[PDB]
């Protein structure tokens, strides 16, 4: 009799991560846990077949069941439209889901005692709090075909003020233009999530913007964070001997680089994307990073791997060549999802299982069994030999064996 897991929304994906996703369910989840699994295939072919309706339905299912576990998916471009003979260049499924759910994507490296960093000073963790709504990820962009005016207008519903601003008057040739926005309520939830995360970890909080350039747009993020801090969190930060400060983004990335870690970094959507990949790599690998969307309701989460479909690696699998893809981030999407499901259901057995799989994953790497990427952290990529790492399947087998052992010993450890 397996553990009673409960209701979980799973989103199947593409390429290398799709392969890995099936191996994880079969070898690490299904032998030990029984779930009411709400499966949505977000594979590029199924999104094309359903005119991207499957993505909207999966997002609505997460709203209802409170816990999502998502596989990395292809965001189609011109080359992808050609490859899969798509009806349209479908929008990012992550963007669709995040737009519907809202919240903050909290990203952090998965640390192993034997893995060396690329950044010497990072002795404490860096938690990135990426705002999951608006800006470039819900923008309107277009090609300007030739000379003419691009204007941006605001028309109040309950006002008079049709305000028209000239963006640019193209006098010779064309180019490109775009409009983007953000919402006060979403910014307020992002500020609250950031202050709360810093207080739960007991670390200082830094918000990065470019308010010297985008005086109104970024100035608003700065003003909302400062206002919420002064009125609702300042005394709490002072009590834990921590602080909150705004920094310019270019200063912030340089500060982070020369720091020792141990802080929460509130990032605007775009910066959170870019810098989350820099922080994961700085600590060792993109395969070694947790990614959880924490919704503003405080009950709903969508767990995923911060990295993508690992297309480069999938192209090697396609050629029947050997692959060594790190499945740890994909595994931690399941464990973080199951841990949240356990917390909602007060399921001590599911919570034990979720944590045990995380320990098994870290212990296996710490025991010297790892994928090529992690072996390159220790030895340097040119000094890496076949004997130093395990392939994708080999690594999954070792994890399955170690998981079986950890769960057997835990059961035996139970006293009368």
Ligand X SMILES: *[C@H]1[C@@H](C#N)C(=O)[C@@H](C)[C@@H]2CCc3cn(C(=O)c4ccccc4)nc3[C@@]12c1ccccc1
Residue ranges in contact with ligand NAP by CB under 6 A: 72-75, 94, 212, 248, 251, 254, 285-287, 304, 307-312, 325-326, 329, 373
- Number of residues binding to ligand X, judged by CB under 6 A: 17
The answer to whether the CB of 18 falls within 8 A of the CB of 47 is no
Does residue number 250 form part of the binding site for Mg ion (CB under 5 A)? Answer: yes
- Smaller CB separation from ligand NAP, 91 or 201: 91
Does residue number 286 form part of the binding site for ligand X (CB under 6 A)? Answer: yes
- Smaller CB separation from ligand X, 112 or 350: 112
- The contacts of residue 3 (CB under 8 Å, 6+ apart) are 32, 33, 34, 347, 349, 350, 353
CA angle 109–112–115, rounded 5-degree value: 95
CB of 401 to ligand X, least distance (A): 20
Q: Which listed residue (310, 350, 354, 365) binds ligand X by CB under 6 A?
A: 310
Burial environment of residue 163 by CB neighbours within 10 A (0 to 12, 13 to 18, 19 or more): exposed
- Smaller CB separation from a second copy, 97 or 286: 286
Q: Which residues pair with 126 in a beta bridge?
A: 263
CB of 299 to ligand X, least distance (A): 30
The answer to whether 155 is annotated as binding is no
What are the Cα distances from residue 76, in Å, to 16, 36, 40? 16, 31, 18
The option from Mg ion, a second copy, ligand NAP, none interacting with 49 (CB < 5 to 8 A, set by class) reads: none
Q: Which residues pair with 106 in a beta bridge?
A: 129, 292
Beta pairing, strands 289-294 & 205-209: unpaired
The answer to whether 74 is annotated as binding is yes
Does residue number 381 form part of the binding site for ligand X (CB under 6 A)? Answer: yes
The answer to whether 313 is annotated as binding is yes
- The contacts of residue 170 (CB under 8 Å, 6+ apart) are 144, 146, 147, 148, 149, 150
The residues binding ligand X (CB under 6 A) are: 286-287, 307, 310, 312-313, 316, 323-326, 329, 371-373, 376, 381
Per the annotation, where are the binding residues for substrate? 75, 92-98, 107, 130, 210
The residues binding Mg ion (CB under 5 A) are: 250, 273
């Amino acid at each position: 009799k397996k553990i009673s897991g409960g209701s979980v929304v799973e989103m199947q994906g593409d390429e290398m991560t799709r392969i890995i996703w099936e191996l994880i369910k079969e070898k690490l989840i299904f032998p030990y846990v029984e779930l009411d699994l709400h499966s949505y295939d977000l594979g590029i072919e199924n999104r094309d077949a359903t005119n991207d309706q499957v993505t909207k339905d999966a997002a609505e299912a997460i709203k209802k069941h409170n816990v999502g576990v998502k596989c990395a998916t292809i965001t189609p471009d011109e080359k992808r439209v050609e490859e899969f003979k798509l009806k349209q260049m479908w929008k990012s499924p992550n963007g669709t889901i995040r737009n519907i759910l809202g919240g903050t994507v909290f990203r952090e490296a998965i640390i192993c005692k034997n893995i060396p960093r690329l950044v010497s000073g990072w002795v404490k963790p860096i938690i990135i709090g990426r705002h999951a709504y608006g800006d470039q990820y819900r923008a309107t962009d277009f090609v300007v075909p030739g000379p003419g005016k691009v204007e941006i207008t605001y028309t109040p519903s309950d006002g008079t003020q049709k305000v028209t601003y000239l963006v640019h008057n193209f006098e010779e040739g064309g180019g490109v233009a775009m409009g983007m926005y953000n919402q006060d309520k979403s910014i307020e939830d992002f500020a609250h999530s950031s202050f709360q995360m810093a207080l739960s970890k007991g670390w200082p909080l830094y918000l990065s913007t470019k308010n010297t350039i985008l005086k109104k747009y970024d100035g608003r993020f700065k003003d909302i964070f400062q206002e919420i801090y002064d009125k609702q969190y300042k005394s709490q930060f002072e009590a834990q001997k921590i602080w909150y400060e705004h920094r310019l983004i270019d200063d912030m990335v340089a500060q982070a680089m020369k720091s020792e870690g141990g802080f929460i970094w509130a990032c605007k959507n775009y910066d959170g994307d870019v810098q989350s990949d820099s922080v994961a790599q700085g600590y060792g690998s993109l395969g070694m990073m947790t990614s959880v969307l924490v919704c503003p309701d405080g009950k709903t989460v969508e767990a995923e791997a911060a990295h993508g479909t690992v297309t480069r690696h999938y192209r090697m699998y396609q050629k029947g060549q050997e692959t060594s893809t790190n499945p740890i981030a994909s595994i931690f999407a399941w464990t973080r999802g199951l841990a949240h499901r356990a917390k909602l259901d007060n399921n001590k057995e599911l919570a034990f299982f979720a944590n045990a799989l995380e320990e098994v994953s870290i212990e296996t790497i710490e025991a010297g069994f790892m994928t090529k990427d992690l072996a390159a952290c220790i030895k340097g990529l040119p000094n890496v030999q076949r004997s130093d790492y395990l392939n994708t399947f080999e690594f999954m087998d070792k994890l399955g064996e170690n998981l079986k052992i950890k769960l057997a010993q835990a059961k035996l450890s139970l006293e009368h």
